[PDB]
Amino acid sequence: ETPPRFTRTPVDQTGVSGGVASFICQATGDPRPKIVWNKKGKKVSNQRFEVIEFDDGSGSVLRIQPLRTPRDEAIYECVASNNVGEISVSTRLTVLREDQIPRGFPTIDMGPQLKVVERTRTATMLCAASGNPDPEITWFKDFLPVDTSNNNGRIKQLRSESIGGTPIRGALQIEQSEESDQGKYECVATNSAGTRYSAPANLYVRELREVRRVPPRFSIPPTNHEIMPGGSVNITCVAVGSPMPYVKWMLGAEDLTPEDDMPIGRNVLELNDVRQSANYTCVAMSTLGVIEAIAQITVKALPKPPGTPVVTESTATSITLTWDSGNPEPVSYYIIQHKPKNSEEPYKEIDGIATTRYSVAGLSPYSDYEFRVVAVNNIGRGPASEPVLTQTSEQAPSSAPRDVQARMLSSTTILVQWKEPEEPNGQIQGYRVYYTMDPTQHVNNWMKHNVADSQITTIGNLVPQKTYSVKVLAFTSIGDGPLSSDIQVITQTGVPGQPLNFKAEPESETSILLSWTPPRSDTIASYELVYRDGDQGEEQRITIEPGTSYRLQGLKPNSLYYFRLSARSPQGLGASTAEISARTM
Amino acid sequence: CTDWSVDIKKYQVLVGEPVRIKCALFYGYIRTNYSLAQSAGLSLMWYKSSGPGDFEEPIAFDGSRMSKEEDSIWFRPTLLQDSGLYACVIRNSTYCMKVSISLTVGENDTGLCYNSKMKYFEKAELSKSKEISCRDIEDFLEPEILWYKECRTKAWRPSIVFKRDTLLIKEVKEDDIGNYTCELKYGGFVVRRTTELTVTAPLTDKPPKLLYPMESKLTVQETQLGGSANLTCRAFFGYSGDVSPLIYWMKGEKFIEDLDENRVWESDIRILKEHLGEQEVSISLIVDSVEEGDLGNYSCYVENGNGRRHASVLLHKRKHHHHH
Ligand SMILES: *[C@@H]1O[C@H](CO)[C@@H](O[C@@H]2O[C@H](CO)[C@@H](O[C@@H]3O[C@H](CO[C@H]4O[C@H](CO)[C@@H](O)[C@H](O)[C@@H]4O)[C@@H](O)[C@H](O[C@H]4O[C@H](CO)[C@@H](O)[C@H](O)[C@@H]4O)[C@@H]3O)[C@H](O)[C@H]2NC(C)=O)[C@H](O)[C@H]1NC(C)=O
Ligand SMILES: *[C@@H]1O[C@H](CO)[C@@H](O[C@@H]2O[C@H](CO)[C@@H](O)[C@H](O)[C@H]2NC(C)=O)[C@H](O)[C@H]1NC(C)=O
Ligand SMILES: *[C@@H]1O[C@H](CO)[C@@H](O)[C@H](O)[C@H]1NC(C)=O
Ligand SMILES: *[C@@H]1O[C@H](CO)[C@@H](O)[C@H](O)[C@H]1NC(C)=O
């Protein structure tokens, strides 16, 4: 058992004639203390005095309304008592007439009004009081004091911000309203001068709303775009809900529709010159939250360059190329530019390749080209891919060696030299001499030699006065090119080189002149002149003098006669010139 | 969203005059002004309910009549359908607060210019100077004011100095009673603000005056035991303002109400004669069962802000009949 102890003690009050005063006494003890209200020790009761009890066996409130002055003006006391102990508390009451209401005394300018919220909905009560010093606002429900100690909970207190000039505003906020909250509410304004009550306002509480409000939601969201630099586009945004929200367009932070005029529910955006890219927000707001949704407006101007321009097949006169598109977006087709490596001339351009693989034809064999790839769609040609260099590898020479020539050195040795093919076709890996002592054998049995890009070689151990046959070809690393021939040379002394600038002209109907140039070899016995009446003639030889030109006579008019030269040295015969024919007048 | 409900300041106005409804929240509740609210990236929105509780439609503006200049709404003119509650909302996206402001579009009372139920109220004294104002105009601001009397242009006597927004009767007569309606141009339209003038006698400086009973004459009331008793005090008050008359009874040093226990009680103060603005009031003592017990001294007390006067009566009984 415990003796009674105060949980809430009454505080002094100063009210106004024909108004209200309330005093509070709440107490705890075992067993539950009874509470009694006294004026000078005596349990007073009076029709102008009403005592109200808390629902819990705690304490009670003494309410005096309407106040009468100066009768009520007296010293009162609260006494709580049980058969285990007794407690009492004193407090003073003062009442005024309005003939001497101090300057700066609270006045109600507007009091709470009847409000009807549904159960589990947020209800707000409003009040207006002024005074100097600033008034304190408190609340009573069904005559009892509310007090919200934890300030955080279903039931919380709102406070005005005192600008220097206005009445104090004040409210009571009830989250999740319940039927227990039903009842008769009155508010109370206090300061160092005294206390004033507003008029009573009842609160009502209903079960459900017919229908509640609708938060804002997008009926027609804002849809992304690609457009040309400075084109036009109509972008529509529509929001709905209850109440209907406004729609302002927004560039992220800044608002695009001007506040003093902001359309309702349906704003459609007209665009002029997008140069640079941007981000457009469309906001809708009702009283049930703010919603957002963005549109991306961007302009492109070109495809990116392809990647991986790599060859998966090649031939001597074509190359098959493949590349990845390299692009996220829809390109129409690609164009390839190419020219030879280290060329400063303009690139060639190939239009319309609708795929990521392509074979380039009409190229020249074993020829160097430089490539990049650019993608094109309807805006313009983008930058080139990184470039690639690649040599068209030919798989074999396609022409015989040129200028196969030979001249004699000593009696058991000859000197063979030549010049590179017009169609070298690759890195020349070497040259081949098919020398032999027996010019009637199958080729794998003749004898074998080798040159490696030296244009010249010697062959020895020949036996004097024997016929050797000789043929020459070039080869690359892939394989062999074509053979040349014109040698079955006999091994004795050195020989001169066939003349150059060899031409024949008909000086007359029965005479013809010949112009030729003698080689370096000064020691010259004579030149050989094989002439024959046309094609089916006899091979007759004529003795010409070692000079520069000669005059032949004794021929038939308007008739063709072939001729073939071969320099003749006093040590041995040379090489033969190109086959020319001349017609008599 | 924190709702502050209907604001204290009401807007009432005659069908056909311009009206500028400011948003109350800037001018009292919240700390900042409108321009700053915008800067901090807050939206300002208006909704219109037709009363409580009709759901608020976001109110469709033209630009002519019902426009929306910076922190207020302009009506030019006002229309009967314009009546209602106008919710005014402010918003971050983590912040939401609104208040309602009440607007009443009324019509002239049959035959007049003012609306009978929509006029201010003032009071004045004979032989003392009253200054009628023309208030709540501040939004239209020294143009010409045409004061009417009972809605008719009159030629004013010489004691009436018109300045700008005021008019000053240096010496108030009884004739001065009535409905002063003032008029003003702007828009262009016409706005009216009418105030009714009631005049009173000057402030009395003398204590009240007893009638029943006289402050000297010890008057006596006959009663028999067991009967019921009516001691009706009657006194006169000079104009003491809005203060309710202070007249009451007493028994010795006991005040009546505390003594009772439902046998002896004071009535409710009847006003017998009321006239600009001096009164003849009455309050009576009532004794139900007359004991012995109750007999004797009952004094009526009268009082204002000028002193306290009391008169005295006697409660007693008639003996045996004329037999002596
Ligand atoms: C103690 O004893 C005294 C007796 O002296 C009682 O005092 C009177 O109480 C009666 C109650 O009936 C009052 O009677 C009323 O008279 C009023 C005055 O008349 C009006 O008309 C004149 C015009 O000639 C005006 O100048 C004047 O100001 C009044 O307005 C009336 O107002 C009363 O009401 C109405 O009655 C009829 C219904 O029949 C209505 O149709 C009328 O419109 C009229 O308004 C009533 O007639 C009387 O005024 C009291 N006198 C005094 C001096 O106070 C106490 O009542 C009594 N106390 C008790 C019993 O508790
Ligand atoms: C000033 O205006 C008021 C308000 O209209 C007038 O009060 C009216 O008085 C007549 C008396 O003839 C009554 O019938 C009406 O019912 C009253 N109306 C209201 C609304 O109270 C008053 O009469 C006017 N003053 C003058 C001198 O005419
Ligand atoms: C906007 O929201 C912020 C949140 O930090 C809040 O502090 C502020 O009071 C709100 N209003 C304004 C006008 O900034
Ligand atoms: C309504 O007001 C007008 C002034 O605009 C006035 O002339 C008219 O008389 C009033 N209506 C009635 C029925 O009096």
Author numbering:
A (entry chain A): 28 to 612
B (entry chain B): 31 to 171, 176 to 358
Provide excerpts from the study.
Vertebrate type-IIa RPTPs comprise LAR, PTPσ and PTPδ, which share common domain architecture with a single transmembrane (TM) helix flanked by a large extracellular domain (ECD) and cytoplasmic tandem PTP domains: the membrane-proximal PTP domain (D1) is catalytically active, whereas the membrane-distal PTP domain (D2) is inactive. To elucidate the structural basis for decoding the ‘splice-insert signaling code' in the type-IIa RPTPs, we determined the crystal structures of PTPδ-ECD in complex with IL-1RAcP-ECD and IL1RAPL1-ECD.
For crystallography, we used a PTPδ isoform containing four Fn domains and both meA9 and meB, which is the most abundant in the developing brain and has the highest affinity for IL1RAPL1 (Kd: 0.15 μM) among all the PTPδ variants. PTPδ-ECD binds to IL1RAPL1-ECD at a ratio of 1:1 and the asymmetric unit contains one PTPδIL1RAPL1 complex. PTPδ-ECD exhibits an elongated shape with a length of 180 Å along the longest axis. Electron density of the Fn4 domain and subsequent C-terminal region was not visible, likely due to the disorder. The length of the PTPδ-ECD·IL1RAPL1-ECD complex along the longest axis is 206 Å, which is equivalent to the average length of excitatory synaptic clefts, implying that PTPδ-ECD is kinked at the junction between the Fn2 and Fn3 domains in synapses. On the opposite side to the IL1RAPL1 Ig1–PTPδ Ig2 interface, the Ig1 domain of IL1RAPL1 interacts with the Ig3 domain of PTPδ with a buried surface area of 694 Å2. In the present PTPδ-ECDIL1RAPL1-ECD complex, the meB insertion appears to adjust the relative spacing and orientation between the Ig2 and Ig3 domains of PTPδ.
